[PDB]
C-alpha cells in the first residue's frame, strides 16, 4: 500500500507545516504537524481544558465507533522548544492520504501548554521519529509509520516541504518526478531515537565549501536550521548589519538585506538553501529588523536540520532494516 498527502505552511513565513489526517469512524479530519523529531501522535480533543483550546479542531473519541480507550495508558511530552502536552490514549483508525492504520494509538490531550493553544492552525502532532521515543506509559506505542511499514510497498516516507507553497508527504514510495538529479543516501544513527545523520560540510553563498562533520537530526517539526556557533557566525558575518541579539534570542539582520544562500553536504552531494528561505521577517510587528533562519545550536545540545534545510530538498526517510536518509535537490 501507499499514502499521499498535501502539507501546507501555516503562515506566510512557513513557521510550521500542517497535513490533514482522518481519525476515527466516521472520519474526523484534523490538520497535524508531521514531526520527524518526535514519536507521539497526539491531538487536541473533547477532553482538552476549555481555556487551552483556541480555534483548533478537536478529536472526540466518543463519536468514533472504532475508538477504544487504551486502559491505564497516559502520555506526557516536553519538546526542545519548551512546549508540552499530556493526556490519555485511544486506539483508532487513522488515515493519511488514503493509507490506513487500524489500532493506531491516538494520544488525546487533556492539557496543552500556551505555545500549542496560540497556534489555532495546528490540531496536534504526528510523530515520525523512531518508536523508542514514544511517551505512552506503561506500555509504549508505535508510530503511524511503524504501524504501516509492513503493509507499505517500500518501507519509506518522503518529505517534500514547499517554500511559501504546498508540498507533499508520501508513504510507501519514492516519487521520481519530485526531484532533480539523484538521491544521495547517508548513514543514520537511531541511538538517540532520531533520524540522526552527519552532514559532510557547508558553504556560505558562493564561498568555498568547508569539509567538516556536522552531526544533526532531520527534523520536520523544527522550523529553523540550528548549527554550531562557528558555522552560524561564518554565515551571519556575510550579512551587512547582522548581529546576535540576546533580547531577541538569536541572530537578527536588516529586513532590506538580500541573504546569501547556505549549502550543506550529503556525502559528495550538495543541497543549496536559497537566501530567501533564511528570512523569517520582522522580529516584532512593524520592525525593520528581521529574524534569521540559521541559528546557533549551542544552547540545544544537538544540531537540527529543520524545515529551513529540509524544504530545499526532497527527503527520503528510509525505514529499511538499517535505516538511512536520502536527499536530492528539487
Ligand atoms: N506558538 C509559538 C510556536 N509556534 C510554532 C509553530 O509556528 C508558529 C509558532
Q: Bridge partners of 198?
A: 215
What DSSP string describes 70-139?
A: EEEEEEEEE-TTS-EEEEEEEEEEEEETTEEEEEEEEEEEEEE-HHHHH-TT--EEEE-S-GGG---BSS
Running DSSP on this structure, what letter comes out for residue 151? T
- Pocket lining: 16 vs ligand 1, CB cutoff 6 Å: yes
Grid cell 506503561 in the structure block, residue: 138
Method: X-ray
- Pocket lining: 15 vs ligand 1, CB cutoff 6 Å: yes
Sheet with strand 303-305: strands edge to edge = 269-273, 262-266, 196-204, 210-218, 303-305, 225-227, 294-296
299/80 Cα distance (integer angstroms): 10
161/220 Cα distance (integer angstroms): 9
Cell of 319: 525505514
Neighbours of 279 (CB within 10 A): 17
- Pocket lining: 115 vs ligand 1, CB cutoff 6 Å: yes
Nearest to 98 by CA among 27, 156, 160, 175: 27
In whole angstroms, how far apart are CA 227 and each of 45, 181, 216?
36, 26, 8
Number of helical H runs and strand E runs in the chain: 4, 24
260/269 Cα distance (integer angstroms): 19
In whole angstroms, how far apart are CA 192 and each of 84, 197, 228?
20, 11, 19
178/313 Cα distance (integer angstroms): 10
Ligand 1 center from residue 8 Cα (angstroms): 14
Q: Pairing mode, if any, of strands 124-127 and 303-305? A: unpaired
Q: Pairing mode, if any, of strands 210-218 and 303-305? A: parallel
Q: Bridge partners of 31?
A: 20
Nearest to 146 by CA among 158, 157, 159: 157
- Pocket lining: 219 vs ligand 1, CB cutoff 6 Å: no
Ligand 1 center from residue 115 Cα (angstroms): 6
Cell of 243: 548581529
In whole angstroms, how far apart are CA 12 and each of 16, 17, 100, 166, 277?
10, 11, 31, 12, 12
Would you kindly state where each structural domain of the chain is located, as residue ranges? 5-174, 175-330
What DSSP string describes 211-234?
A: EEEEEEEE-TT--SEEE-HHHHHH
Grid cell 532531520 in the structure block, residue: 218
Q: Cis omega (within 30 of 0) on the bond before 304?
A: no
Are 318 and 185 in contact by the 8 Å Cβ rule? The answer is yes
Cell of 322: 538499517
The enclosing H or E element of 180 equals strand 180-187
234/13 Cα distance (integer angstroms): 24
Q: Bridge partners of 211?
A: 201
75/191 Cα distance (integer angstroms): 22
Q: Which of 16, 31, 32, 79 maximizes ligand 1 atoms within 8 Å of its Cβ, making it the mutation to test the pocket?
A: 16
219/132 Cα distance (integer angstroms): 16
Ligand 1 center from residue 312 Cα (angstroms): 21
The resolution, in angstroms to one decimal, equals 2.0
Nearest to 248 by CA among 289, 207, 196: 289
- Pocket lining: 118 vs ligand 1, CB cutoff 6 Å: yes
Amino acid at each position: 500500500s501507499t499514502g499521499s498527502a498535501t502539507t501546507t505552511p501555516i503562515d506566510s513565513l512557513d513557521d510550521a507545516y500542517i497535513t490533514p489526517v482522518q481519525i476515527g469512524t466516521p472520519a474526523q479530519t484534523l490538520n497535524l504537524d508531521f514531526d520527524t523529531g518526535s514519536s507521539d501522535l497526539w491531538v487536541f480533543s473533547s477532553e482538552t481544558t476549555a481555556s487551552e483550546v483556541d480555534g483548533q479542531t478537536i478529536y472526540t473519541p466518543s463519536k468514533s465507533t472504532t475508538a477504544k480507550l487504551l486502559s491505564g495508558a497516559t502520555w506526557s511530552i516536553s519538546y526542545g522548544d519548551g512546549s508540552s502536552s499530556s493526556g490519555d490514549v485511544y486506539t483508532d483508525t487513522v488515515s493519511v492520504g488514503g493509507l490506513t492504520v487500524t489500532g493506531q494509538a491516538v494520544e488525546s490531550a487533556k492539557k496543552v501548554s500556551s505555545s500549542f493553544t496560540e497556534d489555532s492552525t495546528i490540531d496536534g502532532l504526528l510523530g515520525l521519529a523512531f518508536s523508542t521515543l514514544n511517551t505512552v506509559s506503561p506500555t509504549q506505542q508505535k508510530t503511524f509509520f511503524d504501524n504501516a511499514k509492513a503493509s507499505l510497498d517500500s518501507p519509506v516516507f518522503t518529505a517534500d516541504l514547499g517554500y511559501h507553497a504546498p508540498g507533499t508527504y508520501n508513504f510507501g514510495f519514492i516519487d521520481t518526478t519530485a526531484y532533480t538529479g539523484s538521491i544521495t543516501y547517508t548513514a543514520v544513527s537511531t541511538k538517540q531515537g532520531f533520524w540522526e545523520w552527519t552532514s559532510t560540510g557547508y558553504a556560505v553563498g558562493s564561498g568555498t565549501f568547508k569539509s567538516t562533520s556536522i552531526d544533526g537530526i532531520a527534523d520536520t517539526g523544527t522550523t529553523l536550521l540550528y548549527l554550531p556557533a562557528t558555522v552560524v557566525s561564518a554565515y551571519w558575518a556575510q550579512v551587512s548589519g547582522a548581529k546576535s541579539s540576546s533580547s531577541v534570542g538569536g541572530y537578527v539582520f536588516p529586513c532590506s538585506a538580500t541573504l546569501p544562500s547556505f549549502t550543506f553536504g550529503v556525502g559528495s552531494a550538495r543541497i543549496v538553501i536559497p537566501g530567501d528561505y533564511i528570512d523569517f521577517g520582522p522580529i516584532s510587528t512593524g520592525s525593520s529588523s528581521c529574524f534569521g533562519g540559521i541559528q546557533s545550536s549551542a544552547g540545544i545540545g544537538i544540531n537540527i536540520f529543520g524545515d529551513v534545510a529540509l524544504k530545499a530538498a526532497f527527503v527520503v526517510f528510509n525505514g529499511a532494516t538499517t535505516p538511512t536518509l536520502g536527499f536530492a535537490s528539487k
